[PDB]
Nucleic acid binder design. Structure first.
Ligand SMILES: Nc1nc2c(ncn2[C@@H]2O[C@H](COP(=O)(O)OP(=O)(O)OP(=O)(O)O)[C@@H](O)[C@H]2O)c(=O)[nH]1
Ligand SMILES: [Cl-]
Ligand SMILES: [Mn+2]
Ligand SMILES: [Mn+2]
Ligand SMILES: [Mn+2]
Ligand SMILES: [Mn+2]
Ligand SMILES: [Mn+2]
Ligand code: NA
Ligand code: NA
Ligand code: NA
Length: 326
DNA sequence: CCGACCGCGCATCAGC
DNA sequence: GCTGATGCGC
DNA sequence: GTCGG
C-alpha cells in the first residue's frame, strides 16, 4: 500500500490499454511498472525516483508526477467519462467477454448488466456462465475457505484413484491470505511425457467432483484442462457460500517441477523468469526447460529434479513461492 | 532508433 | 472431418 | 511503454 495510489492508476491504465485500445504490450508495460513500484520499499516522492526502477520510463514518470501533485490523472478522468470505454471496461469484467466481444456488444446496444440478461441468447456457453455468476465471481476467497476446498478436492481425488496427486498452486501456494479462485495441478503415474496409458484421466476427476455437488458448472474442458465453477457445501440453515472459479490441469508426472513452477506464478513472475531464461539461453514452459541453439530452435529437455534446478540453469538464486508474488 | 515483449489449452470460426 | 487463425483466460 | 544494443 506504500504506493497504492500510483499502482492503482497504472493498473487502471493497463486495463484501459487491454480492454479498449487492445494494445497488449502497453497493458504489460503498465503491469510491469506497477509490479516493480509495488515492491519498492519507500513512499515514492517523484517520477525521477520512480524512473530509477526498471520498467518505469519517461511517460510513466510524467504521470507519476501529475498524480503526486493533484492526486488525479486527467487522462483517466477523461476515460472514465467516455461512455463507450466505460461500457467496454464493464462488459469485459464478465468471464468470456473479451475486448473483441465487448466492443461488438456495445455496437449492438448491449452495454449494461440489464442488457446482458435480456440477450442471453447472444452469449456463448462460457459467457452465459460468466454472466450467471457475475456477482459471485467478484468476491474473494478467504484462505480458510481455500483450505476447506483443498480438502474436498484432495480427498475426492484420492477416492477415484490412490495414485492421483493433486497440488493447489496459484496464489494459494504463494501463501496469500485470500485468493481470486482455486488452481489445481493434477498428476497420475499412468500419464508421463512418454505415454498415456490411461484415458479419461481428467474426466474421471471432474465427474467425481460433480457427483458430490462441488463442481456446479463447466466453462471449458479438454483432455488436460478443466475450467469451471464450484461451491463449498453449507451447514444446516446456513446461507450458501458464493460460487467460485476453479481450474484443474493434468500434467505429465515426470514434469511435475516445471508444472508446479509454471502454475504457482505469479503471472508476472513467470514472464520475468521466462524472459530472463531466454537471455541466458533457455526457454521455459510448464513442461520443460530447454536450451536454445545458435539458430534459436529449442534443444532437448534438460534434467530437472526440483524447482531449484530450473532456477540453477538460468543463474537465479532460489525464491520461495511466497516471494514470487509480482 | 528499432525490435522484442512467456508460453499454452480450449472454444469458435473460416476454409477446404 | 481436418487444419489453421483468432479470442480468451489464463 | 520500456529497454538493450
Ligand atoms: N505463463 C503464464 N502463466 C500464467 C499466466 N497467468 C496465470 N498464470 C499461471 O496460472 C496461475 C493461476 O492463475 P490465476 O488464478 O489468474 O492467478 P493467481 O496468482 O492464482 O491469483 P488469484 O487467483 O486472483 O488469487 C498463476 O499463478 C500462474 O502460475 C500467464 O499470463 N502466463
Ligand atoms: Cl501493444
Ligand atoms: Mn488463482
Ligand atoms: Mn485460476
Ligand atoms: Mn445429486
Ligand atoms: Mn451463487
Ligand atoms: Mn535478466
Ligand atoms: Na527505469
Ligand atoms: Na472478461
Ligand atoms: Na480473478
Amino acid at each position: 500500500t506504500l504506493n497504492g495510489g500510483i499502482t492503482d492508476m497504472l493498473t487502471e491504465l493497463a486495463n484501459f490499454e487491454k480492454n479498449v485500445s487492445q494494445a497488449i504490450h502497453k497493458y504489460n508495460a503498465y503491469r510491469k511498472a506497477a509490479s516493480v513500484i509495488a515492491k519498492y520499499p519507500h513512499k515514492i516522492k517523484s517520477g525521477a525516483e520512480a524512473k530509477k526502477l526498471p520498467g518505469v520510463g519517461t511517460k510513466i514518470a510524467e504521470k507519476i508526477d501529475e498524480f503526486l501533485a493533484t492526486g488525479k490523472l486527467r487522462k483517466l478522468e477523461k476515460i472514465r467519462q467516455d461512455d463507450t470505454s466505460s461500457s467496454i471496461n464493464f462488459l469485459t469484467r464478465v468471464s468470456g467477454i473479451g475486448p473483441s466481444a465487448a466492443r461488438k456488444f456495445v455496437d449492438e446496444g448491449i452495454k449494461t448488466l440489464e442488457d446482458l440478461r435480456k440477450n442471453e441468447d447472444k452469449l456463448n456457453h462460457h459467457q452465459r456462465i460468466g454472466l450467471k455468476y457475475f456477482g459471485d465471481f467478484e468476491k474473494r476467497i478467504p484462505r480458510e475457505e481455500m483450505l476447506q476446498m483443498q480438502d474436498i478436492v484432495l480427498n475426492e481425488v484420492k477416492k477415484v484413484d490412490s495414485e492421483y496427486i493433486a497440488t493447489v498452486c496459484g496464489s494459494f501456494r504463494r501463501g496469500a491470505e485470500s485468493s481470486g479462485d482455486m488452481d489445481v495441478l493434477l498428476t497420475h503415474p499412468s500419464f508421463t511425457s512418454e505415454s498415456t496409458k490411461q484415458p479419461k484421466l481428467l474426466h474421471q476427476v471432474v465427474e467425481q467432483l460433480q457427483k458430490v455437488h462441488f463442481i456446479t458448472d463447466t466453462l471449458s474442458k479438454g483432455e488436460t484442462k478443466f475450467m469451471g465453477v464450484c461451491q463449498l457445501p453449507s451447514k444446516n440453515d446456513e446461507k450458501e457460500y458464493p460460487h467460485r472459479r476453479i481450474d484443474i490441469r493434468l500434467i505429465p508426472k515426470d514434469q511435475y517441477y516445471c508444472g508446479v513452477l509454471g502454475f504457482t506464478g505469479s503471472d508476472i513472475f513467470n514472464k520475468n523468469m521466462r524472459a530472463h531464461a531466454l537471455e541466458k539461453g533457455f526457454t521455459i514452459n510448464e513442461y520443460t526447460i530447454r536450451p536454445l541453439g545458435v539458430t534459436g530452435v529449442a534443444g532437448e529437455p534438460l534434467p530437472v529434479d526440483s524447482e531449484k534446478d530450473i532456477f540453477d540453469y538460468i543463474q537465479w538464486k532460489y525464491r520461495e513461492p511466497k516471494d514470487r508474488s509480482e
